[PDB]
Amino acid sequence: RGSHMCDAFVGTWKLVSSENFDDYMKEVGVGFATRKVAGMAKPNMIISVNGDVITIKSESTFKNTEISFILGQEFDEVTADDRKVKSTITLDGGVLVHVQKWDGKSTTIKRKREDDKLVVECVMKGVTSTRVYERA
Ligand SMILES: COc1ccc(S(=O)(=O)Nc2cccc(C(=O)O)c2F)c2ccccc12
């Protein structure tokens, strides 16, 4: 199989900046202690593609997580803050768009390549957080 546009996300990434993440987590409903510990973490994100399957791993002192998925196909996800959600991830004009649904709520996580960075924009209702990753 040949190259895919989504190969631009493949690699090992490290968190270098975070804005408004505590307020985003508050809007999602994350409790005090999890917010405090999760907000300290500086995760590494490892993204790989094998055929139609994309795998995103996150390693940190807070939690280690791994999801594998096919674009447009819903899957079960237990998030780092221990929500059990239904997730669907699609590609929209170069942007990975990840929607998590649970308990009648939903949040959208967008991942995009910007210069040499991977920029993650998390939205819950009117509250947005921006997390920026660089190559490890
Ligand atoms: C480090 O603590 C966390 C990690 C991951 C998630 S998440 O799995 O639900 N989605 C998500 C949200 C924000 C940033 C990223 C990112 O990529 O940096 C992300 F993937 C969390 C959700 C709530 C509270 C803490 C979370």
Q: Report domain extents, the chain.
A: 1-136
Ligand 1: list residues with CB < 6 Å: 25, 28, 30, 38, 41, 43, 45, 62, 79-81, 109, 120, 122, 131
* Rounded distance between C-alpha atoms, residue 79 and residue 25, angstroms: 12
The candidate with the shortest Cα–Cα distance to 24, out of 133, 131, 111, 134, is 131
Q: Which residues of 80-115 are buried (b: 16+ CB within 10 A; e: fewer)?
A: bbebebebbbeeeeeebbbbbebeeeebebbbbeee
Work out the number of other CB atoms within 10 angstroms of the CB of residue 124.
20
* Rounded distance between C-alpha atoms, residue 45 and residue 29, angstroms: 23
**Structure's resolution in angstroms:** 1.6
CATH architecture of 1-136: Beta Barrel (2.40)
Ligand 1 center to residue 38 CA distance, Å? 8
Task: Please give the sequence-ordered ranges of beta strands (E in DSSP) within the chain, or none if there are none.
Answer: 11-19, 44-50, 53-59, 64-70, 75-78, 84-92, 95-102, 105-114, 117-124, 127-135
**Alpha carbon 27 to its chain's center:** 16
Ligand 1 center to residue 25 CA distance, Å? 9
**At 28, is the secondary structure helix, strand, or coil?**
helix
Q: Which atom of ligand 1 is nearest to the CA of 100?
A: 9
